[model samples]
Target: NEVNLLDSRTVMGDLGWIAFPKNGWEEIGEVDENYAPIHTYQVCKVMEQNQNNWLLTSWISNEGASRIFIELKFTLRDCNSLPGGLGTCKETFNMYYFESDDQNGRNIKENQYIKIDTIAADESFTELDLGDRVMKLNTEVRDVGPLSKKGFYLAFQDVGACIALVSVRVYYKE
Candidate 1:
């Protein structure tokens, strides 16, 4: 029988943190030049479109866990930059996940990656004061022997509206 491994929260460390684009993820916003925390968060503004945005997490060395859980923390709002509006607003976006068994994650190319899931959200917004929204994505996967040799990745693409990412959490078994 196979024993359950620890959750990614303990073993994964900071690999789950995507509040910023620090995790080898390109096409996302970058930190401020002066090292200021303000505006350091990743944001895709209104009416903007981004493609091929991906984040490759650090490798997991354990093997035999067949199911994994992923979570994304973000906030969505309208183009109303100012604070005084009670009007209706909406936004839509797409997200994806990929897996690879390449020895070096950076060597994993677009075609080499395996597509695991695709997520689409058509959401209506009211107030920005409510803060970050936590979105959960759970999916089945193979045992860790293969995945541990390479790595796992997450990707995001947007069509329109204001979207801000806070962080990402992933839970996995041995």
Candidate 2:
């Protein structure tokens, strides 16, 4: 049996993005602008500054499963449209996770998360030609057993690029 860790129906935050309240997760960081190019409705534009943009989830208890899968839905603006169009036009995202036997992973200062994976847009496109894409990552947990009962937190970081978040989903086998 597989289960979803995020809620897909309710809207949260001022921009009306999907809510992650099912397990007490909240969206962090301030959106620089309401990007309204590829999508008329607009999405959360994450920029690099004092406000580091990222989506963080609460500790999710392992359900006797060894692996988990994550899916991120977003639109990345090509570097050509940025200040300095460099080698690659694609923007990259960093994913991290913190595993704990208790809920101490929730304390930011007390623990350091591990970089699980890094994903980028399928192709590069400028503001004139934007593209919406979904990337998925499947990886093993730190510990897994019938009675281990350990927990872990998941996060997606916008690595100082022109990016807009749509929805993120995490799935685990039951």
Candidate 3:
């Protein structure tokens, strides 16, 4: 069977603005909603730099699955908020993966990144093919092994665009 591993329990850099007095990224559904949201925004002028901070997420693997897959959806701010229109409203992301054991995390790779050129559309998402990283590098009777962290992140600047996430899903299989 297929399933979406990302849910409300999935944490972000921030829980978002709706929880406060209405300032900052607003989480779209209700408090009882089962899935959370991630949104990056900029409110500065065109030439000004405005890289939003990184948004991070993690997941545990099945230990035996041969592969891992990721997918998500996001949209950008409209042309009215961007001086150069769609071309200006671009979003870039830097992602990281960590191998963890004994309460400490080590970098799995230098860095993983992708850029979304909203020039084609206002919405986008990506699928990541994480191979054996999906399974255990070590296994034993303890089975307390092979838990890696996949960090999903992004930064947006100056364009006043919103690289907002509707949802992100991670999955694994035999």
Candidate 4:
């Protein structure tokens, strides 16, 4: 049901997008699979440890945005990392927003927020509201709602765990 609802690719337009190692070394991480980039969930590994990263989209349009979609994998996901197996070591991080109108992602405390702990890799997917004007920092303070604001980040504070991003998609209605 949720997947069917988010099947909006046909009705939405793409903002800014990156498709892995298209020409090699385009992204900023390591490559596990040379031939099948999708298998390892990346053609390029961008986010490095102890790094603060942000990906600014082409500014949310005047028509408003629906949601942000991500397809990625969890790094350090080996026998040691997954001592309990998959979904056991899934990490949660805060999703923030900056927007074209904000000064470097600074827009009050409750703007453009979401929580991402479990990574859906290998053709699997997940969805959360844009929380456009709210917060999703932890258990006591989290709410995934409408897209009231724009963003310049996917999420942050990935100290405990990391993501090997393959691709991301944003959707909107005109």
Q: lDDT by residue for model 3 over 72-149, one digit each (tens)?
A: 434433345445532333443333333322232332234343433222232332322224322212111101123344
The TM-score of candidate 4 is 0.35
Off by over 4 Å in 2: 7-54, 85-90, 104-106, 129-149
Candidate 2 overall lDDT versus native: 0.49
TM-score of each model, paired residue for residue: 0.47, 0.56, 0.43, 0.35
User: What lDDT score belongs to each candidate, Candidate 1 first?
Assistant: 0.41, 0.49, 0.35, 0.32
Candidate 1 residue lDDT tens string, 1-174: 334232332232233324223332322333455543322124443332342334445444334444555555455564456243433223444455455564343332544444444433344344634533333212233322234433455545443335554544455644
> Which sections of candidate 3 miss by over 4 Å?
3-5, 8-29, 32-47, 50-52, 79-81, 84-89, 102-161
Higher-TM-score candidate of 2 and 4: 2
Clashing pairs in 2: none
* Candidate 4 local distance difference test against the native: 0.32
Q: After aligning candidate 1 to the native by TM-score, how far in Å is the CA of 63 from where it should be?
A: 3.9
What's model 1's lDDT at 9? 26
Cα lDDT, model 4, residue 150? 46
- Index of the highest-TM-score prediction: 2
Cα deviation of 60, candidate 1, in Å: 4.6
Which digits, one per residue and each the tens of the lDDT, describe model 2 over residues 60-104?
A: 666556666665665566665665433322367666776767753
Candidate 1: Cα lDDT at 137: 19
lDDT, residue 156, candidate 1? 52
**80-124: candidate 4 lDDT, tens digit per residue:** 433343322334323444333452433334655444443322221
